[PDB]
C-alpha cells in the first residue's frame, strides 16, 4: 500500500464502478463495495453520487438520470451513462409495453425523448406491435390461458418409475 498518491486515485474507482454497474454485474458491484469498503462513503463524491445513483435505480429510476448527467464536472462518466441509457432504453422496451394495458403518445413522448425519432418508433415496432394514431395499446398478450393438459400426469409417473427403483435398490 506504501505508494505515492495520484490525483485520479478514487475517481478511477468511480469510473470502474460506473462501467461495472452499466455492464449489469452485481457481484462485481458488491466486490466493488467490498474491495475497499470503508473509504467509499465520505470521500470521492464520484463514488457516493454513483452509489446513491444505484439507490435511485433501486427506488425511483427514470427520474434522476438526466438530473445526474447534469452533475458530472469530470467528463468521463457520461460515456458510461450512455451505456446506462442503453440499459434504460432496453428496459423501456421491456417495461412500458407488453406488461401494461395501453399508454397514449405523450407518455412515450416524455419518457422516450426527441418526441418522434426512428428510435421510439424502433421501440414501438420492437415490441412486435403496430401503433395507431395517438395511442400505444399493449394488447394481444398472454394467449389461450395455457395449462399443460396432462403431461405432468405422465412424466411424474415417470418419476414414480425411479421411485419404484428406490423401492428396488433397497432389498
Amino acid at each position: 500500500e506504501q505508494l505515492p498518491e495520484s490525483a485520479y486515485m478514487h475517481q478511477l474507482l468511480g469510473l470502474n464502478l460506473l462501467f461495472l454497474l452499466s455492464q449489469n454485474r452485481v457481484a462485481e458491484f458488491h466486490t466493488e463495495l467490498e474491495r475497499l469498503p470503508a473509504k467509499d462513503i465520505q470521500t470521492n463524491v464520484y463514488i457516493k453520487h454513483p452509489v446513491s445513483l444505484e439507490q435511485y435505480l433501486m427506488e425511483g429510476s427514470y427520474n434522476k438520470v438526466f438530473l445526474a448527467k447534469g452533475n458530472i464536472p469530470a467528463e468521463s462518466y457520461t460515456f458510461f451513462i450512455d451505456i446506462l441509457l442503453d440499459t434504460i432504453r432496453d428496459e423501456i422496451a421491456g417495461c412500458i409495453e407488453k406488461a401494461y394495458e395501453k399508454i397514449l403518445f405523450t407518455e412515450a413522448t416524455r419518457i422516450l425523448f426527441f418526441n418522434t425519432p426512428k428510435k421510439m418508433t424502433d421501440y414501438a415496432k420492437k415490441r412486435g406491435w403496430v401503433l395507431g394514431p395517438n395511442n400505444y395499446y399493449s394488447f394481444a398478450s398472454q394467449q389461450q390461458k395455457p395449462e399443460d393438459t396432462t403431461i405432468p400426469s405422465t412424466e411424474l409417473a415417470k418419476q414414480v418409475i425411479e421411485y419404484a427403483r428406490q423401492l428396488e435398490m433397497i432389498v
Binding site: 466486490t31 427506488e59 417495461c95 395449462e147 405432468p152
Partner: protein, 473 residues
Amino acid sequence: EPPPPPAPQDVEMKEEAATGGGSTGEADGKTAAAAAEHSQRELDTVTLEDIKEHVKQLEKAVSGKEPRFVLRALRMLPSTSRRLNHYVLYKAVQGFFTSNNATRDFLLPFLEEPMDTEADLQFRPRTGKAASTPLLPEVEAYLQLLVVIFMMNSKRYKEAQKISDDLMQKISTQNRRALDLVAAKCYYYHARVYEFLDKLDVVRSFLHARLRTATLRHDADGQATLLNLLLRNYLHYSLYDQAEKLVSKSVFPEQANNNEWARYLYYTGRIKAIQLEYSEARRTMTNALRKAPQHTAVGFKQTVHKLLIVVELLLGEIPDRLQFRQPSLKRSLMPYFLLTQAVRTGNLAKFNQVLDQFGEKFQADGTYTLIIRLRHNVIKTGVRMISLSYSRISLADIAQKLQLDSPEDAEFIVAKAIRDGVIEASINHEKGYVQSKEMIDIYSTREPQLAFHQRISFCLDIHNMSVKAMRFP
C-alpha cells in the same frame, strides 16, 4: 499449596495413559478409518484443557511437566512405559526436589528433544501432542511478545510432524486422519499466532498446498477444515477467493462433525449474503442456525444468529425475533430488536434514527450493504403490507399516503413489484387510476400436487438417509 499437587497428577495421567496406550491399540488395530476412540476423546479433553489447568498453568511451584515428558521422548520396549511412570513419580519436583522451571527458556532444546531422543516408533500423535500442547495452551498467556515465533516454532515441529506424516510411513498410517484433526486445530493456532499481528503468508500457499496434500489421496476431514480456513480468513482479508472456489467447488463425501458442517454452511451462507442470492441462503443459514445448538453461555449462537438474519430481514419478510432474545444480547443490542420493530412499521424517521444513531453498532455490523436497499425494503414492506391488505387500491391512496409526491413514482414501485411478481396490479394510464386487482384460483387444483414432488422427494431422500444410517453398524 498442598491442593495443587494432586489434581494435575490425576487428570494429566488419565489424559496420556488413555491417549498413548489406546493410540497404540488404535494403530495396531491394523485398519481403522473411523474408530479413533482416544483421538476424539483427547480432543474432547484438550478443548477441556483450554478450560482446565493446562500442561502447567504455572501452577504455583515451578510448572514442571515441560521439563518432564519430552525428555527421553522415546517409546522403546515397554520399559519406556516405566519411563512415563518415572514421569509420574517425578511430578513432585515441585514439592519434593529442587524446582526447575524450563518454560519459554529451555523449551527450544525441548522442542529439539523429540528428535534428540531416538527413532519414533510410528506413534506421531504423542509427538503431535508434544508439538501442540506445550505452547498452544500458552496462547492463553495472551502476551504474544517474542513467544509468537516460539509458538510458531512449536508449529514448525508440527511441520516436522507433517514431514514424518506424509513423508514417512508409506503404508497406510491412518493416524494421518488423526493428525489432520490435530493439524487443523493447530492451523487455527497458526491463526491465533499470525492473525494477532500478521497474515499467514506461509499458510496462504501452504493452505493451498495442504489442500494439495489432502485433496484426494488422503483427504478426510482435512478438506473442510482447510476450507473453513479458506472461507474464514478470506473474509476479512478480501474476496473473490469465494469466486476462486467457483470453478473447483468440492465438498466432503460424507458430512463431518455436526458443529463443523453447521459452521461451514454458516460461512458459505454468509458469503451468499454479500452475493445477494437470497434463495439458497435462507435454508442453508436456517440449517446452520438450528444445527449448532451448543455454545458458551456468553453467547456465540446469538452471534451466529445476529450476523445471520440480516439478509433474512433483507428478504422482504422475516419472522419476529421473539424466539431469540437473550438478556446479555439485550444489553449488547447485537441484531437490534428495534430494527426489526421498524421493519414491521412503515416508519422512516425512527428507522433512519436507528441508522444514524446506531452507526456505532453498524461498525460491529460491517454489512453496510443492508441499508441502501433496506430503506428500499422499508418502502417495499409498506407497499407489500398495503397491497396485501387491500383488494383494489389506487395511486391516489398509496402514492401520497406513503408521500411518494406523485403517481408515477408509485407506478415505478408497483412496476418493480410486478417485476418481482408480488402484486398482480394494473395501471389505468388514462385518468390516473391504479386499477389494481387480484388473481384467482388459489384452490389446490394444480399447485400442491406439484409441490408434493418436493415434499415426497424430501421424504424419500430421508428414507435413503435412514437407509445409509442403517448401513453403518
